[PDB]
Design a binder for these strands. Structure first.
Ligand code: K
Ligand code: K
Ligand code: K
Ligand code: K
Ligand code: K
Ligand code: K
Ligand code: K
Ligand code: K
Ligand code: K
Ligand code: K
Ligand code: K
Ligand code: K
Ligand code: K
Ligand code: K
Ligand code: K
Ligand code: MG
Ligand code: MG
Ligand code: MG
Ligand code: MG
Ligand code: MG
Ligand code: MG
Ligand code: MG
Ligand code: MG
Ligand code: MG
Ligand code: MG
Ligand code: MG
Ligand code: MG
Ligand code: MG
Ligand code: MG
Ligand code: MG
Ligand code: MG
Ligand code: MG
Ligand code: MG
Ligand code: MG
Ligand code: MG
Ligand code: MG
Ligand code: MG
Ligand code: MG
Ligand code: MG
Ligand code: MG
Ligand code: MG
Ligand code: MG
Ligand code: MG
Ligand code: MG
Ligand code: MG
Ligand code: MG
Ligand code: MG
Ligand code: MG
Ligand code: MG
Ligand code: MG
Ligand code: MG
Ligand code: MG
Ligand code: MG
Ligand code: MG
Ligand code: MG
Ligand code: MG
Ligand code: MG
Ligand code: MG
Lengths: 144, 64, 189, 117
RNA sequence: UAGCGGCGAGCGAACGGGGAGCAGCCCAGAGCCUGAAUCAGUGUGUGUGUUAGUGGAAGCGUCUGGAAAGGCGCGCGAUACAGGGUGACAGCCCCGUACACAAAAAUGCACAUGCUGUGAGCUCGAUGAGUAGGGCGGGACACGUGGUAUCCUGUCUGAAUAUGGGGGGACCAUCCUCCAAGGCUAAAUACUCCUGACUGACCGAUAGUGAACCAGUACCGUGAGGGAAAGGCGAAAAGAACCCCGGCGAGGGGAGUGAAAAAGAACCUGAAACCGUGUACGUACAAGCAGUGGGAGCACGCUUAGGCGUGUGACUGCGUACCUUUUGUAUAAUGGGUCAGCGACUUAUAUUCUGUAGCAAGGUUAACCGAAUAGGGGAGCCGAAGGGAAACCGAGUCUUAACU
RNA sequence: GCUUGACUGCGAGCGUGACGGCGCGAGCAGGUGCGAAAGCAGGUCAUAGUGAUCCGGUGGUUCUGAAUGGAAGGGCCAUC
C-alpha cells in the first residue's frame, strides 16, 4: 500500500469526450453536432419548451388550481416516527424536538405508514383510522 | 446558478406518484354551448401527459 | 484484536484511492489566470474593414486566433477541493490502519520521547529501532520531540488528532504511542 | 498546464516526410503535399496487392498459352485437358515449367492431349 | 418556493431557522446636586511594534572531469536539510536559515497618570405639523394598477397629537404590536494604487503584463487615441598580442585564449521551409495527380560465394491531389505559396441519467467554529405516501347523490 | 298522435392522431318520454357548419380566506 500502488475501482473513471481532435476519435471535425443549422452553432439551440413556433404544450393547456398556504404548514407523521420522540408523548412540540417535522409545521397527521410497537400517547394531532387502530393495538392512546 | 422553473408550466402540470404529470384538458374554457355534454364531460377529469411530450414538460419543470 | 473494525478490516482500495485523491486535491492552491479576449490590453477597434481588402475578416486585435490575443478559455482561480463523506473518510482511515498492521508497518509503543530538543537524540533513538522513514504519532504535542524531528526530512511527528490518510501511506513505518492508539480508536469508533 | 506542441508536431511531420523519400519536388519536402502523397501511395499499395495477383496470373496464362501453342494446343484446351487428366499443377508452376523445363511442359501437353482425345 | 409576468421571455421575495458580530445613546428643559460618568484634545511615563543592525553550528580523503557540490570511502552539525550562490547536483565553501539579541533618533499602538475642555446622577417634566393621511402624476417595493397593502414625492391639500397615533398586504370590526414627522453610534461587511513576507499540479520569450530588453518607448495619428518588435558568448573576458591577403577596408586565413571558437561577440542548442557544392544512378522519340504493382541495368556495401542489402529506376499494368460543400466534384465550385510556432466543445453553478464508492429506511450536512483536508456544526435538503384545485382524507384518494 | 333522451353522472372496450386533440361505444346509476309490450331515445341518414391558451365577464359553490371573524381576490362547476 503506497501512493504509487492505489488504483480507482474499474468503471469509476470514464474519460471525457474531447471533440474536434481528428478522424480516429470519432468526434473529429463537426464534434458530434452534424452539419449546419442552429444546433451546430456556438450558443445555438432553442429554449426549453420551444416547439418551432407551434403553440407549446405548456401554453396550449389551461392553468388549473391554486396553491394552499395551509398545506405548507401541514405534515404527515409515519408510525415509525412515533418511537423517535423522547418520552413516548407525540405532540407537535415533541415531533419538532425530534426533528420529525419542521419548526413552522402547525398541523400534523399520523398515517398508517411503517409500524409501531410501543404505547405512545398521541396528543393534539389528527390520526388516520388505520393509524389509530395501530397505535391502540400497541397499547397507545389518541388524545385529541 | 439554480435552474429556473418555467413558471407557466408549473401552473399547468402536477407531478404524479410514478413521476408522470397530470394536466387539465384543453377545450373547456369557452364556446361551450355548441359542444356536446359527452365531449365536455370527458374533458373535465385531469389527464396524463403523453410519452411524446414528457421530455418537453420535464425540461420545463426541473424541480417538480 | 484494540478494535477489530478499526485495525482488522479488509483493504477497500477504491475507497482509500478516493480519499487519497481528495486529500491531494485539497492541497491544491488553484491560483492562476490567463486573459480572455476581454482582458487583454488593447482597443476594440476593428483592425480593418469587413470587406474589400483581400484579408481574412478581423474583429478584435484580442482574438484568440491572433498572436498576443486572448486565451480562448482563459483559466480563472479554481477551488479543487472535493467533498469526502465523513463515513468514507473514516472508512478509508480504518482500511489504511488495518493494512499497516497486516503489512507490519504500524509499530505501537507505550511511550515515545526524547529528553532534550536535540535532533541527534531522535536520530539515535530511531536508528536503534531500525527506523529511518517514520510517522511518529503521539497522544499530545510534545515540544522537544517536535523540535528534534523538524530537521529530519524522513521523520514526521504528529498528535493523534492530526493523522491524515496520505501520511499513513507515505511513510514507510508508523510509530503510534499506546495513548495515540486509544485516541485513534475513539476517533474512528 | 500549458503544453507546447513543437517536439510532438516535429516527430509526426518527420514520420510522414520519411515515408515520402524519393518523391518529386514538394512531395518529398513539404508536409502538406507529402502527407497527401503518402496517403495516396498507401491507397495504391492496398489496391495493388489485389492487382498483383491478377497481373501475375495474367502473365502465367499468356506464357502457358505460348508454350501450349508451341506444342500444338491452345491454352483453353490445355487447361481443360489437364483438368480431365486430374493434374492440379497451378498456372504459376506451369508457366515456370514452360520457361525452364520445356520437355516437362511437352509431357504435360501430351498428358492433356491424351485426356481430351 | 410564494408570487410577479404581452401569466410570454423572463423577474423572483418574505416569514422562519442556522451562523459571524454584538452596544447602545443623546437633543426637543428646566430644577436640584455639582462638575463626579464617558469619550475627545494636548503632555509625561510605561511597556510593546516599526523605521538601520548583531552573533548564528558542522568535511575531509580519493575517482572522473576544464572545473566537483557528482561517484566512492570515512566523519560531523541539526530548535539550522527554508532558499540562494559558488567552474556539474553542497546540511558542514559562501550568503543565509533555526535560534538568540539590538536603537542615538523619529514614530504606530496599548495602558498608567496630570492639565484643559466634556459634563454623570436624581426628581419634575416634555415627546419632532405644512407632518401623518388624502386627490392627481410618477417612481420604489420580487409585486408590470392589479382586488394592491407598504415606502418616496412633482403638484393640490391636510389631521389627531398619548383620553392620541402607525402597522398587521384591498377594506371593516376585534385583538395584538409599535410610537413617524430630530440626531449620533463600534464590530461582523467591501476594496487594494501601494509596502513586506510567503505560496502555486500558474507562464517560461508568438507564452506570461502591451512592456523579462531604457515600453506606454519607437512608430502611427491634427487630436482624443492607437501602439510594436526586441532575452541567452563563456566558469571566468581569458572578448582573439602577433603574422598574412585586402582599400592603413569589409571579410577571411593562421597564431593565441578556452573544456569547447562548427562558444568569436550576425555568439547556448541550432529544427523546417528555402538555397548551394560534391558523389551514385537516371534523364535529350517523350505525353497527363508524378505514385503504386511489376522490373532490367548501373554503383556501392555484405557472413551460402553466394545471394542479399542500400541508392537509382530504363521499360511496363493500374492510376484525374487534399479540404469543404453537396443529389453529385479531377472538377473549370470553396480554401490553402511553403515552413515553423500559435489557433476552436471550456469554466462555474444547478439539474437529470449512467458508472463507481460509502452508508442504508435512512443518506448527507451548509454557513460557521476549528491552526486543524480532522473533529464539531443536522439549520437544512433528499427519501421512506399518495390522492385531490382545495379543505381534507390517507394505503388509499378523487370523481359522483352513489358507483357495477 | 303524444312528447323533451337536444337528459345529469359515468363508462368495458375500440378507432384516429407527433402532440394538443377528435371520434365510436355497449353497459352501470339517477331521473324522463313514447309504446299494450318487446323495446327505443344521451339530438338530426352519415361525413363540413370551426378557434388552443392567456386575460376578463356572469351565475353557482363558505374549497381557499396573509393576526382572528368576515370580506376582497383566488379555486372548483356551469357559461360568455
Ligand atoms: K451528438
Ligand atoms: K521532520
Ligand atoms: K568528492
Ligand atoms: K547550498
Ligand atoms: K402630502
Ligand atoms: K393600536
Ligand atoms: K496591446
Ligand atoms: K507583445
Ligand atoms: K509506372
Ligand atoms: K452548391
Ligand atoms: K467561383
Ligand atoms: K452531470
Ligand atoms: K451515484
Ligand atoms: K379506485
Ligand atoms: K337510463
Ligand atoms: Mg462518425
Ligand atoms: Mg461545416
Ligand atoms: Mg442542411
Ligand atoms: Mg442539425
Ligand atoms: Mg457567438
Ligand atoms: Mg430540522
Ligand atoms: Mg370556466
Ligand atoms: Mg497573451
Ligand atoms: Mg466536516
Ligand atoms: Mg511549461
Ligand atoms: Mg529533404
Ligand atoms: Mg553560519
Ligand atoms: Mg555545464
Ligand atoms: Mg414622536
Ligand atoms: Mg404611513
Ligand atoms: Mg403623502
Ligand atoms: Mg393610499
Ligand atoms: Mg407607481
Ligand atoms: Mg393598514
Ligand atoms: Mg511578450
Ligand atoms: Mg526560444
Ligand atoms: Mg580583421
Ligand atoms: Mg557544434
Ligand atoms: Mg552581439
Ligand atoms: Mg551552458
Ligand atoms: Mg549557435
Ligand atoms: Mg517516332
Ligand atoms: Mg532516349
Ligand atoms: Mg509533358
Ligand atoms: Mg494510365
Ligand atoms: Mg449544386
Ligand atoms: Mg469523379
Ligand atoms: Mg465541371
Ligand atoms: Mg479547385
Ligand atoms: Mg485546371
Ligand atoms: Mg462559398
Ligand atoms: Mg486561393
Ligand atoms: Mg402528499
Ligand atoms: Mg331528419
Ligand atoms: Mg345531413
Ligand atoms: Mg396578462
Ligand atoms: Mg383574515
Ligand atoms: Mg390582514
Amino acid at each position: 500500500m503506497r501512493l504509487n500502488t492505489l488504483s480507482p475501482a474499474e468503471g469509476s473513471k470514464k474519460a471525457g469526450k474531447r471533440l474536434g481532435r481528428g478522424i480516429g476519435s470519432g468526434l473529429g471535425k463537426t464534434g458530434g453536432r452534424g452539419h449546419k443549422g442552429q444546433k451546430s452553432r456556438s450558443g445555438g439551440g432553442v429554449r426549453r419548451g420551444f416547439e418551432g413556433g407551434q403553440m407549446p404544450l405548456y401554453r396550449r393547456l389551461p392553468k388549473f388550481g391554486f396553491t394552499s398556504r395551509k398545506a405548507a404548514i401541514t405534515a404527515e407523521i409515519r408510525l415509525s416516527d412515533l418511537a423517535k420522540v423522547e418520552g413516548g408523548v407525540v405532540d407537535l412540540n415533541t415531533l419538532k424536538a425530534a426533528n420529525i417535522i419542521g419548526i413552522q409545521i402547525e398541523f400534523a397527521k399520523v398515517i398508517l405508514a411503517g409500524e409501531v410497537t410501543t404505547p405512545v400517547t398521541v396528543r393534539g394531532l389528527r390520526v388516520t383510522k388505520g393509524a389509530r387502530a395501530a397505535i391502540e393495538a400497541a397499547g397507545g392512546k389518541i388524545e385529541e | 446558478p439554480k435552474i429556473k422553473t418555467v413558471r407557466g408550466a408549473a401552473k399547468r402540470f402536477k407531478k404524479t406518484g410514478k413521476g408522470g404529470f397530470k394536466h387539465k384538458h384543453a377545450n373547456l374554457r369557452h364556446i361551450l354551448t355548441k359542444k356536446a355534454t359527452k365531449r365536455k364531460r370527458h374533458l373535465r377529469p385531469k389527464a396524463m401527459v403523453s410519452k411524446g411530450d414528457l421530455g418537453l414538460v420535464i425540461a420545463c419543470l426541473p424541480y417538480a | 484484536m484494540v478494535s477489530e473494525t478499526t485495525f482488522g478490516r479488509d483493504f477497500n482500495e477504491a475507497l482509500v484511492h478516493q480519499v487519497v485523491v481528495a486529500y491531494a486535491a485539497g492541497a491544491r492552491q488553484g491560483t492562476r489566470a490567463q486573459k480572455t479576449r476581454a482582458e487583454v490590453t488593447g482597443s476594440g477597434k476593428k483592425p480593418w474593414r469587413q470587406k474589400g481588402t483581400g484579408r481574412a475578416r478581423s474583429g478584435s486585435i484580442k482574438s484568440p486566433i491572433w498572436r498576443s490575443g486572448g486565451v480562448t478559455f482563459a483559466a480563472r482561480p479554481q477551488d479543487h477541493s472535493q467533498k469526502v463523506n465523513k463515513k468514507m473518510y473514516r472508512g478509508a482511515l480504518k482500511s489504511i490502519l488495518s493494512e499497516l498492521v497486516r503489512q507490519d508497518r504500524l509499530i505501537v509503543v507505550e511511550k515515545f520521547s526524547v529528553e532534550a530538543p536535540k535532533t541527534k537524540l531522535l536520530a539515535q533513538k530511531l536508528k536503534d529501532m531500525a527506523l529511518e522513514d517514520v510517522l511518529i504519532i503521539t497522544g499530545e504535542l510534545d515540544e522537544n520531540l517536535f523540535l528534534a524531528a523538524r530537521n529530519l526530512h524522513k521523520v514526521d511527528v504528529r498528535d493523534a488528532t492530526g493523522i491524515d490518510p496520505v501520511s499513513l501511506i507515505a511513510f514507510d513505518k508508523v510509530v503510534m504511542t499506546a495513548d495515540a492508539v486509544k485516541q485513534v480508536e475513539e476517533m474512528l469508533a | 498546464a500549458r503544453v507546447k506542441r513543437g517536439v510532438i508536431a516535429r516527430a509526426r511531420h518527420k514520420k510522414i516526410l520519411k515515408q515520402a523519400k524519393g518523391y518529386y519536388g514538394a512531395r518529398s519536402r513539404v508536409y502538406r503535399v507529402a502527407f497527401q502523397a503518402v496517403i495516396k501511395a498507401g491507397q495504391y499499395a492496398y489496391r495493388d496487392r489485389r492487382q498483383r495477383k491478377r497481373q501475375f496470373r495474367q502473365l502465367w496464362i499468356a506464357r502457358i498459352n505460348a508454350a501450349a501453342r508451341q506444342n500444338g494446343i491452345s491454352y483453353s484446351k490445355f487447361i481443360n485437358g489437364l483438368k480431365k487428366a486430374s493434374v492440379e499443377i497451378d498456372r504459376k508452376i506451369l508457366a515456370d515449367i514452360a520457361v525452364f523445363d520445356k520437355v516437362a511442359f511437352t509431357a504435360l501437353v501430351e498428358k492433356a492431349k491424351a485426356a481430351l482425345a
